[PDB]
Amino acid sequence: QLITVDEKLDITTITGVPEEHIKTRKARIFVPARNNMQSGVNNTKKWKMEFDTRERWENPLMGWASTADPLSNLVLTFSTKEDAVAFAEKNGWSYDVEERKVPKPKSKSYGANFSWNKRTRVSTK
Amino acid sequence: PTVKPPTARKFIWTNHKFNLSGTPQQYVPYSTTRKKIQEWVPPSTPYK
Amino acid sequence: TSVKPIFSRDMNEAKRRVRELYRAWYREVPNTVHLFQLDISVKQGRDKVREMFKKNAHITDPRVVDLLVIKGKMELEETIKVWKQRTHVMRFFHETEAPRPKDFLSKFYVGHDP
Amino acid sequence: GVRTSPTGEKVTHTGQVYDDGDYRKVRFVGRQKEVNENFAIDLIAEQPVSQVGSRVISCDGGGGALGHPRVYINLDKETKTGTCGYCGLQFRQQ
Amino acid sequence: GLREIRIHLCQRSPGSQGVRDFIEKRYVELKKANPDLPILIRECSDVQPKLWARYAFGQEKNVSLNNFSADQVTRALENVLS
Amino acid sequence: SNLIEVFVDGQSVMVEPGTTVLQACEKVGMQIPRFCYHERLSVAGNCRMCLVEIEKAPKVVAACAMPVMKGWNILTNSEKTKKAREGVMEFLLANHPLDCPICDQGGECDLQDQSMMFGSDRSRFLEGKRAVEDKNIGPLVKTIMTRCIQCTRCIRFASEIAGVDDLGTTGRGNDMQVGTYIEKMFMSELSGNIIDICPVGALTSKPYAFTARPWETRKTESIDVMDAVGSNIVVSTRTGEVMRILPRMHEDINEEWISDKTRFAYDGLKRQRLTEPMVRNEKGLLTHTTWEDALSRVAGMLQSFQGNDVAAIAGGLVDAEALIALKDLLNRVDSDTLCTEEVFPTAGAGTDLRSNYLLNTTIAGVEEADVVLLVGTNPRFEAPLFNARIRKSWLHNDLKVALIGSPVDLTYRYDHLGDSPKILQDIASGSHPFSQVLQEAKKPMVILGSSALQRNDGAAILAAVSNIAQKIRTSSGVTGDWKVMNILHRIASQVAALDLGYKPGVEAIQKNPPKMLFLLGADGGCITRQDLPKDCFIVYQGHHGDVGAPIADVILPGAAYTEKSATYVNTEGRAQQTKVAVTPPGLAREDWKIIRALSEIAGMTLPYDTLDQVRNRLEEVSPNLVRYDDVEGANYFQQASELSKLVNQQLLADPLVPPQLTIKDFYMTDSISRASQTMAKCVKAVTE
Amino acid sequence: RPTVRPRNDVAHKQLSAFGEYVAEILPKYVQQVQVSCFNELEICIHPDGVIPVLTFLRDHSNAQFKSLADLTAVDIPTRQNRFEIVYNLLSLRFNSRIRVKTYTDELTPIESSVPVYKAANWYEREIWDMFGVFFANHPDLRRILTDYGFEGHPFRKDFPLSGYVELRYDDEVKRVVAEPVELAQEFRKFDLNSPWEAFPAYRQPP
Amino acid sequence: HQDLPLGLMDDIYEFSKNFSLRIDELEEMLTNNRIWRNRTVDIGIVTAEDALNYGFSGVMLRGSGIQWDLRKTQPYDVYDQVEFDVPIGSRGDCYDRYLCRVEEMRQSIRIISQCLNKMPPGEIKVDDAKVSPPKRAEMKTSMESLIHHFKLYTEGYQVPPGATYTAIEAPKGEFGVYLVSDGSSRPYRCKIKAPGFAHLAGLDKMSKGHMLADVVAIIGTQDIVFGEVDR
Amino acid sequence: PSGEERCIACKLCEAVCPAQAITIEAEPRADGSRRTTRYDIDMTKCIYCGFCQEACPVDAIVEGPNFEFSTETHEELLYNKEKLLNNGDKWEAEIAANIQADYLYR
Ligand code: SF4
Ligand code: SF4
Ligand code: SF4
Ligand code: SF4
Ligand code: FES
Ligand SMILES: [K+]
Ligand SMILES: [Zn+2]
C-alpha cells in the first residue's frame, strides 16, 4: 500500500553535505560549448552541472595549486535540462540554466564560388 | 665495469655521492618557477 | 504523489518515532559522558542532542523523517555499544575549529567566500 | 651557467631565485639549495653545426630507437640553421 | 526632494497598455515641463508595470500601474512630482 | 512542400534543396569527418576526408560539396566509405611530421582524433618525408608549415571573413605551399582566428606556445569586455592561472570568432596589478595597508561630505553590480554626480529612452538590412566583430554600405560620401543623391558611432542622424517593425551605466568640482587634479595601476573581468554575465563587495549582502539587466526625435575623424591591453 | 580473425530462449530482457518483484541459481530513480550466469533479499553505506565500510572524491580530530573525451 | 606489457623442478601431525548447501564436496588446453580445506610444467594499435604509431558502452568485476567482487559452537586479505 | 649525449600517471626550445608503476635502478626538476646500460 506525499522533494538533510556547500554554492546548468580548436561536436551532446569557482592558492613548499573547495572538481552529466534542474532542486542548490546553443543551419553551395556577377566569387582555390 | 666500462659523458658525476639525508647537504624542495603576477609599483614621488 | 512508505504513513506517525529517539538519546548522554570520560558536561551533551534535532525541525516529508530517525538510531547504537571511540563522540563539538566569520565585513576581510 | 644573486643564492637554469625579502629562503638555512650545474641551454650551444649536402635532412637524436621520433628538417633558408625540434642539433646546407 | 523617476512596462502585455499610451502622448510634454528630471523608461517583456520615485538620500517608493489607464498613469505621476 | 526526402543509412530525412550530403547527415546526428570543410567558409572539397558512398553509385562523393538528390541513401558506415576514409587518412599522414609531443595541437587535434576514429592504426610508408621552410607572419601566429595539410581554411578565412587577400598557395603538386610568398605579416584584427580554424598545429598561438595541454585546462565560459560587442569566450585556466582565451560560439553576436585584442590581451592581467589597499603616508607616497585602515579613511571622508561635494567616474571595464552599488552609496549622501568617461549627449530625451543609445537593429539584424550608412566611426577597430558581420552581409547579401567620415579601410568596398557633418543635413533635406538610396531601401540601417559623440557638437550630430532616420520612417519604404536608428558603442560598461541612470561624460564634475571623487576603474585621464580643488580626496578602485591610481589618495584593489561574476550589457542592450575563472590576486576583492563593505563602515549600509541580492537590486532599477542573453527591444523613436528638435545645436566645421585610423591604434585602448606585453609587440610589429 | 573476439551464437540463442522463459513466467514484474553481444542475460524488473523473481531463479528446477555472485548498486543521477540495484547470480547446475536489475531512489526502500540468499547480508549493508539505499527487513543494517559517524554516501556521483572532512592528530586536545578538507595540491581534473564519435552502433537518435 | 626476457623460462623450470619437495617438507610438518589435526579437523564445518547460499567460492566450496572450479567450468585464456585435477574435500572442515590448498599447489606445478613446454611464439599484445600501444621503435618512426601512442597514453582507448560481470578462479575463490562502460575512455562504474568478502561474512555462522582459539583457525582457513574485503 | 635535456614538456607522463604524482610547467626557452620550467614528482604519491617511462616518447623520464633513498623527512621525497636532473647525471652510467639491455623488448 502506498501513501500520499505532496511535499516538494528535498533531501538536503539526508545527503551529509555541509550547509556551507548547499546554501552558498551556485550551480550552473549548461551544454558545454564546442572546443573551438576542433570540429568534432560529440562533446556538445549532454547537459552538465558545475559549481562556482573558488579560491586556489600556491602551496608555500612546492608552489602547487591548493584548494579548500570540496566541489572544485564536481561535474555531473544529464540527458536533458529538466533532469539537471530536478537534481539541483532536490539537493537544494541554487542554480542557473543557460539555453543550449545550436549551430544555425547554413546555406552552402560550391557553385557560388564561381559567380558570374556576385561577390561570392572566390579569387583563389 | 673493469671489462665493460660505462659510456663516458661529460655531464655524468665524476664523484659519486651517498645518501645525504639528515646532513647539511640534504635536498630541500622548492618551486622552480618564477613569479606569475607582477604588482604595480607606486611612483616614488609625492606628485599627488 | 503516491509513494512507498519507509516506516511512517504520515507525519504524526513519524513524529512519534522522533520523540522516541530523542528520549533514548536524552537518557544515553550521562552514560556516554562517563563511559568515554568526556570533559564536557551532561548539560553540554544534552544541548548538543537538542541542536542536532532542531536543525531538522523543518522537514515535512514522513519518508525523510524516517531516514533521519533510522540514521539517528544507527548513531546511537554506535555510541552505546562503544563502537565509536572518544574522538568520534567529540567530533560533534568541533573543538579545534576556529570560529568562522558570520557577518559581511568579517568575511570580506578574510577572503572571497560568501 | 650558474650565477649567484646579490644575496648569494644560485639561480637555476629556469631562472628561479628567491628575492631579497622572501622569507621562503629560510628553508635553505643550515642546508642547501639543490641546483643542477649542467645547463642544457649552454651545452647544446657548444655542438657544432652539421654541414650537409641535401635540402632536407632527418634527425632522430642518434642511437636509432634510443633517440627521439625521426623528423625531417628543411634547410632552404640560408640566414639560419635548421634546428631539430627534439634535441636541438643544428644543420646547414653546404 | 524628488531625484529620479523610473517607469517599467512590457512591450506587449495588455496590463501595460495604459502606460504605453501615456508614453506615446504625455511623455514628451512631461519631459518639456521637467527638463532636468531623469525619467528612466525601461521596457522589459512580461513585467508588471511600475512607477519608481527616488527621493533625497536614496529613499524610494514604487507604485504599481497594472491595468491602469493613461489618465490613471497621469494622476500617479502628478502625485509623485508634487 | 519544398522539402525533398533522402535517407541516411535507410532513415528518412526531409531537407531543403541545395542541402549537401554532409548537411543531411547532420540532421540525423551523424558527423561526417572533414578537414577542409568549415560551415562558415566557402566549400573547398580538396581534403577528400568527407568521401561517402551513395547506395547504387559506384563513385564515392564529397559529402561537403555534393548536393543531395531525391531518394539518395547515404551510407555513412559502409565498407566503401570506411576504406575511402582510411585511404585519405593514409595520404594525409604520409608526409606529416612526427611532431605530436612537441606540437601544441596535441590532445585537441582533428588530425590525431580522426586518425584514431576513421584511419588505420599503422603505417606502410617506407620513404622519406617532405619538409618545408617556416614563414614569419607576425608576433601572434607561429607557423610550423611542415605540419600543414594544405586544407586552405586559412586562405579562405583571410579572404572571406577578414577581407585580406594576403594568403595563398605557391608552387604545384607535392611542393604546393601555403603562405604569403614574399615576407609579409598577417596583422589583421581578426588574424588570430586562423589558429582556431587550422585543423593542425601548423598555425599556433605564439603567446600560448608550450604552456599547457588541452586535457588539463579548466574551461570557464565568460564574456569579453575589451569592446562593447560582448563576444562570448572560454577562459582556459590551469592550477589557478589563466592560460588563454578562446571563442565561444554565439550565432547572434560573434559567431565563432574573436578579435585579437580579445584573444591576446589577457596577459595584461598578469602585469601592473593592484593587489593591496594603499594610502598616502606622511611623505605623500602610497604605502600598503589593510582593508580596515583604507576603508576607515575613505569612510571618514564620505561622512564629512554631502551633495555635490561627492562625485564618481566610472571607467570602461566596470560591471553593473559595482555600478549600482556605487550609485546607491552616493545617493545615500544625496549625491547624483555619477558620471562615465564616455560621453553621450543628454539633449532631448538623453538616456530617458533606451532606444536613444542602443543598436536597436541588433548585430544579427545587419544580415537583413539592404543599405547601411555609417556615420563617424571605424567599426573595424571600434567593434571588429560587428564589422565582420557587415562584411558577411556585404559578401552574401550584396549589402550596400556608405560612410560619412574619414575614408578608413573596412575590408570591403564602400561608398565614401565625404567626412563633413554637413553631409548629414544634405541627406536629410533630400539634395544628396544617397537620400534616394535610403528611400528606395526596404530595410535601411543608420549607425552613428559613439566615438563621434565624443565631439563637442555631439548632440548636433545625434539630432542630424536621428533626423535622417525620421524621414526614412515617414516614407512607407520601411516595414514598421524594422528599426533604423542605431548607436554603436565601443565601451563595455557604457550601456549598463546608461541603463542605471549614470550621467554620460564628466561635464557635471567640471561644472561642480567635488571635494571627494570616486574613480571606479576610471583610467581615461578625463578628470585630473588640475580640474579639481586643491585638497580633493581621490579614491581609485580598480585592478590595474595605470592613469587613475598614481593620482589617488586611497587605492582599493578590485577584481578583473576574469575574476568575478559580473553583468555587462553590450551595444545592442543584451545583458550577459561573466564567471569567475580565477580569484582576484593578492588582497583584491570583488568590486561590488568593496562598496558594500565601505557603506557599512560609513554607517550607510546598503541593503544587499550577496551577488544575487545586488542583482535583485539591479532588477528594481532596470529589469532588462537580469534578462541574460535576451535583447528586449526599445521603442518610442518618435518621442525621442520630437525632443531632439527642441534645442537647436549647431554642427561644427571639423571633419569626422575616428580615434583609430590604422591598426596601430587598435591594440591598446584600455588598462588591460595597455599593460599587455603581447599588445606592445603587435604595436611594434605594425610600426616597424 | 586473430585480434577480434569470436562470437558464440549457440549461447546467445540459449540465453535468449531462457530470457523469454523467465518473462513468460513472471509477467507481473519483468519489464525488460536483453542479451548482450558477449552473451550475458539481464532481467530488468519492477522493484516489487525482487523476492519473487530471486526466489524463482533460486528454486525453479530449470533455473537453480543457487549462488549469489555479487549484489551492487549504480548511481545514475539523470534518472528519476537514480539507483540501479544489480544482482549477479550463478547456477552451478546449468553452468550459467544471470543478472537481475531493479531501481530505487533516495527515499524508496527495497526489500531485503537476505531470506533468499544469506550472502546478501553484507552486500546490502555496503549498498546502504556507499549509496544510501535502505533495505527493508534487513536483520542488521548499518555502515560496514565507512568510519563511524561518517556523513553522506561516498559512491554517489555527487559526493566529492576527497570528501568534506579529513583527520589529523591535535596535541592540544590530545586526540585525532576531523576538520574541513584542504589539499596542498588540488586533484587535477582532466577533460579526456574526444569530440569525435567513436562507436556509430550506439548512436542515440537526435 | 612485455615479452619474457631470454633465459627466464629456464629459471622457472629449475625452480619448478624442486618445488614439490618443498611441499613434501611442509606436509611432513603438518599433514599427519596430531597437534595440527587437533587444531583443524572438524573445525569450521560448513555444509554444501550453506556454502552455496552464503556466497562462498573456491576452496570454501570444494572443501564441502562441491565439484566446481571456474578454470574447468567457465574456462578463460588457455585453461581448456592444460590438464589438472580439482581437489575435493569430504568433511567440509579446516583440515580438508588445508589439504585442498596443498594439493592445489601440486596441480599448479603440474600446470606450470605444461605451460613451459607449450609456450608458443608470436607477439604478446593484441596487434591493434587503437587498444594496445605500438612498439617503441614504431612509435619513433611511423606517423600513425606516434599518434596512437600519444592518444593511448593521454585519453586512452574508448570502450563501447556496456556492462559485464567477469569472474576468474582466483587463488582465494571467485574474483570478479562488474564493469560498466559509458562509451568513454574512463569506466563509469567498477564493482569488485572479492571472494573473501562473502567468506568473512560467514565467520559468525562457521564459528558457532567453537572456542576462542578456534576463531583464529577459522579466519586462517578462509584466507582473508582485507585489501580485497574493504577495497 | 650532447648534454641537452631529452624532455620536451609533452606532458604524456603527467597525463598517464595513475597517482597524479607528476606536475609540469613549460615555456619557450631563451633559445626557443620547448622545455619545462617545473617538473615535480611527489615520490609519496608515486606508485612506482613505470607508466611515465612507457609513455615518454624520448626516453626522458625513467625509473632508475636505485632503491636505497629513504629519507628522514617527508619533504625530502618531493622531487623538483633539479633533483631529478641531478639523479639523471648521477645514475646515467647505469641507466644507459640497463636501457641498452632491455630496449629491444620494448
Ligand atoms: S598537428 Fe596533430 S597529428 Fe600533427 S604533429 Fe600536431 S598533434 Fe600530431
Ligand atoms: S596552415 Fe592550417 S589552415 Fe592553412 S592550409 Fe595549412 S592546415 Fe589548412
Ligand atoms: S612510476 Fe610514479 S610518477 Fe611514473 S606514472 Fe607511475 S605513479 Fe606516476
Ligand atoms: S618526461 Fe617525457 S613524457 Fe614527460 S613531459 Fe618530458 S618528454 Fe613528455
Ligand atoms: S571536407 Fe569535403 S573534401 Fe574536405
Ligand atoms: K591550430
Ligand atoms: Zn634531433
Swiss-Prot record, chain A:
Q: In its UniProt record, which GO terms are filed under biological process?
A: brain development; electron transport chain; mitochondrial respiratory chain complex I assembly; reactive oxygen species metabolic process; response to cAMP
Ordered alphabetically, the record's keywords are:
Electron transport, Membrane, Mitochondrion, Mitochondrion inner membrane, Phosphoprotein, Respiratory chain, Transit peptide, Transport
Where Phosphoserine occurs, the residues are 123
**Where does the UniProt entry say this protein principally localizes?**
mitochondrion
User: Any idea where this protein resides?
Assistant: Mitochondrion inner membrane
Q: How does the record say this protein sits in the membrane?
A: Peripheral membrane protein
Share the record's PTM remark.
Answer: Phosphorylated.
| Transmembrane segment boundaries | none
Molecular function in Gene Ontology: NADH dehydrogenase (ubiquinone) activity
Task: Identify one Gene Ontology CC term for this UniProt entry.
Answer: respiratory chain complex I
Q: This protein's superkingdom?
A: Eukaryota
Chain residue ranges for the region called Disordered = 99-125
Protein family membership: Belongs to the complex I NDUFS4 subunit family.
Main function: Accessory subunit of the mitochondrial membrane respiratory chain NADH dehydrogenase (Complex I), that is believed not to be involved in catalysis. Complex I functions in the transfer of electrons from NADH to the respiratory chain. The immediate electron acceptor for the enzyme is believed to be ubiquinone.
Q: What does the subunit comment say? A: Mammalian complex I is composed of 45 different subunits. This is a component of the iron-sulfur (IP) fragment of the enzyme. Interacts with BCAP31 and TOMM40; the interaction mediates its translocation to the mitochondria; the interaction with BCAP31 is direct.
**Record's protein name:** NADH dehydrogenase [ubiquinone] iron-sulfur protein 4, mitochondrial
Source organism per entry reads Bos taurus (Bovine)
Give from-to of the shown chain within the full protein. 51 to 175 of 175
From Swiss-Prot, chain C:
Question: Pfam families, alphabetically?
Answer: Complex1_LYR_2
Q: Which InterPro entries match?
A: Complex1_LYR_NDUFA6_LYRM6, NADH_Ub_cplx-1_asu_su-6
GO BP, sorted A to Z: mitochondrial respiratory chain complex I assembly
On whether Mitochondrion is a keyword of this UniProt record, the answer is yes
Q: Where are the transmembrane segments?
A: none
What highest taxon heads this organism's lineage? Eukaryota
Per UniProt, the keywords (alphabetical) are:
Acetylation, Electron transport, Membrane, Mitochondrion, Mitochondrion inner membrane, Respiratory chain, Transport
Q: What is its main location?
A: mitochondrion
An example Gene Ontology CC term for this record: mitochondrion
How the protein sits in the membrane? Peripheral membrane protein
Localization of this protein: Mitochondrion inner membrane
> What quaternary structure, including any partners, is listed in this protein's UniProt entry?
Mammalian complex I is composed of 45 different subunits.
Q: What role does this protein play?
A: Accessory subunit of the mitochondrial membrane respiratory chain NADH dehydrogenase (Complex I), that is believed to be not involved in catalysis. Required for proper complex I assembly. Complex I functions in the transfer of electrons from NADH to the respiratory chain. The immediate electron acceptor for the enzyme is believed to be ubiquinone.
UniProt lists the family membership as follows: Belongs to the complex I LYR family.
Name used for this protein in its record: NADH dehydrogenase [ubiquinone] 1 alpha subcomplex subunit 6
Species, as recorded: Bos taurus
Curated annotation (Swiss-Prot), chain E:
Residues the record lists as N6-acetyllysine modifications: 50, 61
Q: How does it sit in the membrane?
A: Peripheral membrane protein
Which cysteine pairs make disulfide bonds?
A: 10-44
Superkingdom classification of source: Eukaryota
Asked whether the UniProt record includes Mitochondrion among its keywords, one would answer yes
Q: Which GO terms describe its cellular component?
A: mitochondrial inner membrane; mitochondrial membrane; mitochondrion; respiratory chain complex I
User: Where, per UniProt, does this protein localize?
Assistant: Mitochondrion inner membrane
Q: How does it assemble?
A: Complex I is composed of 45 different subunits.
Functional summary from the UniProt entry: Accessory subunit of the mitochondrial membrane respiratory chain NADH dehydrogenase (Complex I), that is believed not to be involved in catalysis. Complex I functions in the transfer of electrons from NADH to the respiratory chain. The immediate electron acceptor for the enzyme is believed to be ubiquinone.
Family according to the record: Belongs to the complex I NDUFA2 subunit family.
What is the name listed in the Swiss-Prot or TrEMBL entry for this protein? NADH dehydrogenase [ubiquinone] 1 alpha subcomplex subunit 2
What gene is this protein translated from? NDUFA2
Span of the entire protein shown here: 15 to 96 of 99
From Swiss-Prot, chain H:
Subcellular localization(s) per the UniProt record: Mitochondrion inner membrane
Q: List the disulfide bonds.
A: none
Ligand binding ([4Fe-4S] cluster): 94, 100, 115
| Quaternary assembly | Core subunit of respiratory chain NADH dehydrogenase (Complex I) which is composed of 45 different subunits. Component of the iron-sulfur (IP) fragment of the enzyme. Interacts with NDUFAF3. Interacts with NDUFAF7. Interacts with CERS2.
What is this protein's function? Answer: Core subunit of the mitochondrial membrane respiratory chain NADH dehydrogenase (Complex I) which catalyzes electron transfer from NADH through the respiratory chain, using ubiquinone as an electron acceptor. Essential for the catalytic activity and assembly of complex I. Redox-sensitive, critical component of the oxygen-sensing pathway in the pulmonary vasculature which plays a key role in acute pulmonary oxygen-sensing and hypoxic pulmonary vasoconstriction. Plays an important role in carotid body sensing of hypoxia.
Query: Member of which family?
Result: Belongs to the complex I 49 kDa subunit family.
Protein name per the record: NADH dehydrogenase [ubiquinone] iron-sulfur protein 2, mitochondrial
User: Which organism does this record belong to?
Assistant: Bos taurus (Bovine)
